[PDB]
């Protein structure tokens, strides 16, 4: 579609606060729902928790130095709500705010643009005790927190993201109960999805009120659905899975409505107050898109809440997570999102892969991660060359970290972390990404 | 006209000697006309002068470090003629030459290409005492100075600019008297304009004689003119203002003549000697080129030409009162390329001034960011239409002495606290840094 | 064919081991055929040898720093076979391997990708004593050495080159005797050419057995031929020169045969055994192309081994070597190679020029070298814009060095070396190349 003079492209890396910071009970930080969830036997593999993680709260200068060495222009990170406002609403924690000031200022000194995500799943436990995302007030608590962060940091930080992956917070956290807070109820999942999206919209309006030059987006993960079957019911299964994973969150933001076919199949009411859909669909400067894999499904009349099930397709390449590797789906997803939702521009805020890494002679050679990265960058640029306005790519992740219910066993870093010593070791994929940033 | 393999683009920042150096009476430097002019009550806002400025004469390593941090590939700077030859013609001041050697070598060690401008308005007072640019000999004194600078520095410096903005030196300095040397006489302004341009041409030839690989250009500022009226006389007002500001200097360089409509309206003769117009129009490797457009209307009573400036209502303006209109930048670039067809164009200055505030040791300047974003976009719009724009130099790296406005008008992407000389990068510096890396 | 999003380009510099390392009798290194050849009166101008060279064995950190300062992404270097296996086949010299480990790891710390060449003319004398490249076993000795290097270093080094410029090793080393080992016999040159090419193929197969992600190529120099005459015999001279210099080595690699017109004109048998041509023609990930100049020739019935002679065409620009400067030939060569041999991609592994340099006030201003570089980069990008898959460019050389039989008098560096002090002084051409790397 013709690269032209003046066009820009941003290369970054991505992390999140609970997954890397540690210092969970230091620096005035209050507990999050993941501190609580991680204390429940069976919730997280190996009984892992984020108490220490990568100790980035103390080691951030080293990690910023690794970012400068990589040559990224941008760093996508999240602010830990319970580190800066431990009670959820009310008093700012000065020690927590000072940490993010030092992080931001350190990034800027090194030429790196920080990209803050306000909510990456670490809801303060003080707010969960009041109902969390099931409580409509949580959307307003989130918007007030967002306003305070923009008041503190938007003199420097101009590109904001409100929430990350509401699919995970709503459905995995409140319907399937495999993420914090561990609730298993469809109606609660529906309420949570609405208040996450309403929070997004209210926070967007609050940030824009701080200053009109600020840019705001949302990060959505999309899981394209296919079926191996040919029956009419298996084609319906694809539509249902696409509606559950993708359109449930994208349609409110970009079309100001929930997908009617899924609303009907649930048979429950979304707690929409007058004015809510206008707030949720407030115009955005960009979409942050997360992509890792496609899902294969088939019809299943017995399944709940919707009559389809996951299938493990045979004879396909898979990562250490068991996730199918299929880069062509990334190209097609990007084209589809641009056509159906027409975001002004798209940033890939997460893409990456996990494999079993081995340290040999103090080094980590990870050719399968390199291969996934190469093929997904190629697929992203194929979409850009067709005219999709992809303005940057952020690798998940800079460093190995706490992979939620999988714990530390699943390593997404381009830089290895030895958790016994906290040593950082760049992998082969780090050298590859460094080259791609420079030579593209 | 899209990018092809091998195409290059240069990102830079720009300063000038009197505006940043300081050390005005140190290191053997002799006075310039701006040292004198800055001493006249009422000439400069707040009684400011360049005695200290940004103290860059002593702090140049810090400023070079800031350039490397920004990631610029080039640094446009000027050589202070009265620092290197205090008497204007005659002996070199070795201490002054050594300063520019240290500056140049420090830039090259950091990977930065210095782009020297030989004349950015600081004529030695020693030469003003002999008539300055009113004196035809000043063109030759300038060419000899230029030759000596190329002999000293062109082993390293391959891209030269002779003079900067003769509009200001000639008309603002000798007709309106609002810039040094402060003279107010049309014939003097005409003489100065011709001898500035002749000096440009003589210096170009002198530099090329030093080495055939050297490249040379001139820097012209252009101020596109519009009118809000529809009468034929308001259209004439646009022509007169365009001729006075732009064609008076562009036509000699690229067409070997002065614009006849302005010559006729002046009613005076340009002091053209045999050979002059061949010299002035000598081929250039590039044009150094913008801040704003002017709005005008006819005024039969105005002098020297029958037009006056108009302050249009409800337009966006900088802290200087200058209209912000980036589309005019695109159209100017297209016009210059068609009208004068320079081999290539470098934007040697573009930028904006706004009231900056230090808050918590930082400077957030969104209006300057917005001006910069929109003018880079407008520049690339012209490049994508085929205009051969090969680079862009932001005015300025640091806040500095803005001539008759003094220090109150801040053009830097890096703030200077004049009490302490601390440099504080503004939001616009981080924006520019990103643009340099990610384009 | 214009730039599209995602396309990459690699900027590098090139050196070779014997030409820069020095430490010839230190660190356990055994002698090479160039140590021997350089001791023969008359073999090398001024009696020069590589005993000390640029002392890069000790000064590599400074040279790597200069690469980082230039901004190159890649460093093409060669491994000295007699430094790492002094006996040619048998035991590794751990001290020699540790040097290449330090070099590689230092390059990677600086963000530079090392591109190893396994054979750049410094055959162990221990193997020359057994016949060198005249002996078929040398192809297998080379493959065993190559396997050992890939086993040691391919955890980090993913892009390999087997041999460099077999034209020089075979014909200049064994027919004209002007390069080591100094033999002057057509049959020996034919045997050597075949065993170099077989060694390439065997080494390629051995490297790929180490790991399937590794990439392998060969470096060939091509010297395009023209004539000033119009006679049919002068047109035949062009064909003969092209066959001798270029097709003799390119045709086996890409067409699995030797050029029949040259075989017939030699009147000798190439010692081809079963399996050899399949091995020599094994698919490659890229061609490393070296180009410096074109040759002008005319028919000469008295000349041997083929009836043509070199002509010094009148009134053309020439370097300090006496080599014609004609950048348009570089564009046309790249187009011809892409059509005739169709390599998957091409890296310019060497291009550059030598001129008499003068140090003035501690600096070196070399406008003729700048001009050659500018014009040849322009010519290369002209071919890329026509669709030739040129993926990178490596300047010969980072530093002035031992120019084989010309000794140290011929300087190819963009960085000057004062051999009395070993001081490195960047030339004007270094600043030009630094600018081109950044601003393209």
Residue numbers in the entry:
A (entry chain C), C (entry chain B): 0 to 439
B (entry chain A): 0 to 288, 290 to 439
Sentences from the paper on this structure:
Here we report, in contrast, on a naturally occurring mutation of an otherwise invariant residue in the β-glucosidase BglM-G1 that balances a trade-off between structural stability and enzyme activity. β-glucosidases are enzymes hydrolyzing β-glycosidic bonds in substrates ranging from glycosides, to glucosylated flavonoids, glucosylceramides, and oligosaccharides, releasing nonreducing terminal glucosyl residues (see Ketudat et al. for a comprehensive review). They are also one of the key enzymes in the bioconversion of cellulosic material. The otherwise invariant arginine at position 75 changed to a histidine in this protein, while the other 36 amino acids deemed necessary for the function and structural integrity of members of this protein family remained unchanged. Our data indicate that the natural mutation to histidine at position 75 leads to the loss of an extensive electrostatic network, including a salt bridge in the active site region and implies that evolution of BglM-G1 traded a decrease in thermal stability for improved catalytic efficiency.
We, therefore, re-introduced arginine, replacing the histidine 75 in this enzyme, creating the BglM-G1 variant H75R. This variant showed enzymatic activity and characteristics highly similar to the wild type enzyme with the same pH optimum and buffer preferences, optimal temperature, and comparable substrate specificities. Overall, the side chain and backbone topologies of the amino acid residues in BglM-G1 and its H75R variant were highly similar with an RMSD value of 0.069 Å over 1217 Cα atoms, confirming that the mutation in the active site did not lead to a substantial change in the overall fold. There was, however, a major difference in electrostatic interactions between the mutation site and the active site nucleophile. The naturally occurring histidine at position 75 in BglM-G1 formed only a single hydrogen bond with the backbone oxygen of threonine 116, while arginine at position 75 formed, in addition to hydrogen bond interactions with residues Gln163 and Thr116, a salt bridge with the catalytic nucleophile glutamate at position 349 Fig. 2 CD spectroscopic analysis and X-ray crystal structure of BglM-G1 and its H75R variant. We then determined the melting temperature of both proteins by monitoring changes in ellipticity at 222 nm, while continuously increasing the temperature from 10 to 80 °C. For BglM-G1 the mid-point of transition was at 51.4 °C (324.6 K with a 95% confidence interval between 324.4 and 324.8 K), while the melting temperature of H75R was at 54.9 °C (328.1 K with a 95% confidence interval between 328.9 and 329.2 K). The variant H75R retained its activity at 45 °C over 40 min, while wild type already lost significant activity (p value = 3 × 10−5).
